[PDB]
Symmetry: C2
Subunit: 71 residues, 2 copies
Amino acid sequence: LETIMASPLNQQSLGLLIKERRKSAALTQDVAAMLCGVTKKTLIRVEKGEDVYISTVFKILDGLGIDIVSA
Amino acid sequence: LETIMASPLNQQSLGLLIKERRKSAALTQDVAAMLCGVTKKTLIRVEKGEDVYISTVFKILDGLGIDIVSA
């Protein structure tokens, strides 16, 4: 039962997680923005790790089927 | 808790997670707010699931030693 040193999410890596999930689902920023109910600009801000309201982030996570949990 | 950490997170359950973790460490709202570098009022907002900036949430999470990860 190998005990490894991994890392928790911060603001930047969350954006990158979102980006990777959007890309793996073959969705453009426009389409994903449509699915998540945000503007392309907002999605772009989030993927870049720029500060927004948590509600926006949860809309994005929910729209892309990304689940986050407590460690 | 066990109902919150055995499910993916939303805004409300995140706030409740913060609250419970704070309570398990025997911390008042003032002290925890102090530890996290936010106001008591802000911590109260987050624990109640009210909308704030993601940076604030990450400050609270980091200050209380709560790690979140991708599922």
